[PDB]
Amino acid sequence: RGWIFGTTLDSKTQSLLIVNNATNVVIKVCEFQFCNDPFLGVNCTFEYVSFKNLREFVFKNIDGYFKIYSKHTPINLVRDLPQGFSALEPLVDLPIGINITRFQTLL
Amino acid sequence: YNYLFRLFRKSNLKPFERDISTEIYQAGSTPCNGVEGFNCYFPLQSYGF
Ligand SMILES: *[C@@H]1O[C@H](CO)[C@@H](O)[C@H](O)[C@H]1NC(C)=O
Numbered sequence: 001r002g003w004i005f006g007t008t009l010d011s012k013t014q015s016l017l018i019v020n021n022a023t024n025v026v027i028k029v030c031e032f033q034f035c036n037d038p039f040l041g042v043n044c045t046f047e048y049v050s051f052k053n054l055r056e057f058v059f060k061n062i063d064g065y066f067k068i069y070s071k072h073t074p075i076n077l078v079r080d081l082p083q084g085f086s087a088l089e090p091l092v093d094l095p096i097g098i099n100i101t102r103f104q105t106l107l
Numbered sequence: 108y109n110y111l112f113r114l115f116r117k118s119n120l121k122p123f124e125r126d127i128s129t130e131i132y133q134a135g136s137t138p139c140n141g142v143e144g145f146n147c148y149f150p151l152q153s154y155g156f
Contacts, residue, residue, distance in 0.1 A: 012128060012130055013126070013127070013128050014125075014127060031127065045125065045127075063121075063122045063123055064121070064122060064123025064124060064125070065123075097123045097124060097125035098124075098125065099121070099124055099126070
């Protein structure tokens with residue numbers, strides 16, 4: 001359901017949080033003191049709001065912009081990545097200005 | 108004194124990189140252990156206009 005990106009991930013430097021709420025996508029950049037092992041279930045320089053599936057994402061950070069590309073496709077078989085080709089299309093281009101060296105996934 | 112600038116950093120910024128951090132700059136052989144001292148500095152000056 002989302003990702004953490006940054007350098008320290010402790011509050012000593014800013015970090016980027018991306019979360020999917022099913023109603024919305026929520027994106028926030030802050031001096032977060034993130035959990036030692038983050039989880040989901042039922043200050044701050046920037047904020048923004050807007051097996052059978054394979055969901056693909058590309059992330060890169062260039063000149064302070066954080067760029068995201070994505071694609072969704074069905075799959076016929078469940079063992080690992082399906083051999084073939086389709087191109088990811090640009091999702092968003094966030095003007096955040098933060099440095100990134102590590103990331104983590106929100107299960 | 109409301110206006111400040113960073114005098115020291117570990118490395119130069121990338122284009123449009125923004126860095127808030129006030130962790131103590133080590134300028135030499137002194138192990139700073141999170142506090143100021145000889146060759147250990149709070150990295151922001153003020154203009155004092
Ligand atoms: C970005 O963060 C890393 C964290 O290890 C640091 O080494 C590097 O100096 C930073 N980049 C810049 C351009 O200062």
